[PDB]
């Protein structure tokens, strides 16, 4: 008793969608935080070093003060990197985890029940004429009820896929905003170093 | 005995030395925060490739599949400008600072060690006079070699500022290129969302 080719195609797209969703989530996290114990920013740890050594050196000449300026720039960068991790967790990671825990999970449960009903009907078909026809009819329409529940769940997830595009757009918007802010921070510290070099 | 100014220069050289090392190490760890990658595939490129793979495997042209290709290629683009940053920072910031450590700062520790040698030479002859003063003249000579070394490093300060400047320039170029990459793919995703 073999499910149609259209049902198997939807089921395959649904399996790809689910695997994409988990691997993309994992890889976005590993991109945000390549350090496995982090999954303070690295830029903060650098900021602090530059700042402490700037202070230890004093305001006498030019290097100590430059370290204060660059140290502060790095601290700012870390503030905006911290906002990136938060906005990506909330708007990209969490929506995909929920997708996995709710919609993709219900589908898998639907496929499990369908697999059971399918085997039931398989069995009753072999008992054909030796069992009541009502008993065969029941296995048949129970199998059909399941097939329809599964197929409408898979179909809806596939037709609502523009929501996954909204999630991708959320990841990108957050990175865009982070990078734009980093440009402003660094443009400003650039001016202060160039001035300092020129005097 | 040493001028309070010689001792102050020595102090500042110590700090500069310790700053140079700590900051190199923290800059590297900021380019590559994963210790296992820090042996020598950036993280953006592994994301890019996952998105590209799943885009093509999905085999569905409604929305998600095409968008994965679009963002996949954006992520690979960011990967490339990140390569450039890592290379630029190593070349214009990390190497200049390792060179300052290996050459100038080493040279000053060598001079300061010779100077102590001279002190011990004199500090032993003090237990027993044209000689007890030929040694104090040798110390004095070593003092001025040491202090002209320290002086030159500290006075030429603006080179270190110039090195910080190269770290910033590399970061700024990187972030500017990341902005434009991300702007182009923002347009592709909005047109897609606009149809739906």
User: Cα–Cα distance between A161 and B62 in angstroms, integer?
Assistant: 8
DSSP state at residue B39: T
User: Cα–Cα distance between B123 and B149 in angstroms, integer?
Assistant: 24
Tell me the resolution in Å.
Answer: 2.3
3-state secondary structure of A6: helix
Tokens 């008993």 belong to which residue?
A: A135
* C-alpha radius of gyration, chain A, whole number: 29
Is the CB of A160 inside 8 Å of chain B's CB atoms? no
- Provide, as residue numbers in chain A, all residues whose Cβ is less than 8 Å from the Cβ of B167: 70
Residue A86 has which token pair? 């938060």
Q: How many domains does chain A have?
A: 1
CB contacts under 8 A, A 40-69 vs B, are 42-43, 45-46, 49-50, 53, 56-58, 61-63, 66-67
Non-local (6+) Cβ contacts of A45 within 8 A are B26, B29, B30
- Domain range enclosing A99: 1-199
Is the CB of B153 inside 8 Å of chain A's CB atoms? no
Residue A107 has which token pair? 């589908």
Are B47 and A57 an interchain contact pair (Cβ–Cβ within 8 Å)? Answer: no
Chain centre to alpha carbon of residue B38: 14
**How far is the CA of B119 from the CAs of A59, B14, B54, in angstroms?**
33, 21, 72
- Provide, as residue numbers in chain A, all residues whose Cβ is less than 8 Å from the Cβ of B183: 176
Q: DSSP H helical segments within B126-157, as ranges?
A: 132-155
User: Cα–Cα distance between A180 and A91 in angstroms, integer?
Assistant: 19
Supply the CATH number for residue A96's domain: 1.20.1270.60
């Amino acid at each position: 008793t073999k499910l149609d080719d259209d049902f198997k195609e939807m089921e395959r797209k649904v399996d790809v969608t689910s695997r994409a969703v988990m691997e993309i989530m994992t890889k976005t996290i590993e991109y945000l935080q390549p350090n496995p114990a982090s999954r303070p920013q690295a830029e903060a740890l650098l900021a602090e070093a530059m700042l402490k050594f700037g202070r230890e050196l004093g305001d006498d000449c030019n290097f100590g003060p430059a370290l204060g300026e660059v140290g502060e720039a790095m601290r700012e960068l870390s503030e905006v990197k911290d906002s990136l991790d938060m906005e990506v967790k909330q708007n990209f990671i969490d929506p995909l985890q929920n997708l996995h825990d709710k919609d993709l999970r219900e589908i898998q449960h639907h496929l499990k029940k369908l697999e059971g009903r399918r085997l039931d009907f398989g069995y009753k078909k072999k008992r054909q004429g030796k069992i009541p026809d009502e008993e065969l009819r029941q296995a048949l329409e129970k199998f059909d009820e399941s097939k329809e529940i599964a197929e409408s769940s898979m179909f809806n997830l596939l037709e609502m896929d523009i929501e996954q595009v909204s999630q991708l757009s959320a990841l990108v918007q957050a990175q865009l905003e982070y990078h734009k802010q980093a440009v402003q921070i660094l443009q400003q510290v650039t001016v202060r170093l160039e001035e300092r070099i020129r005097q």
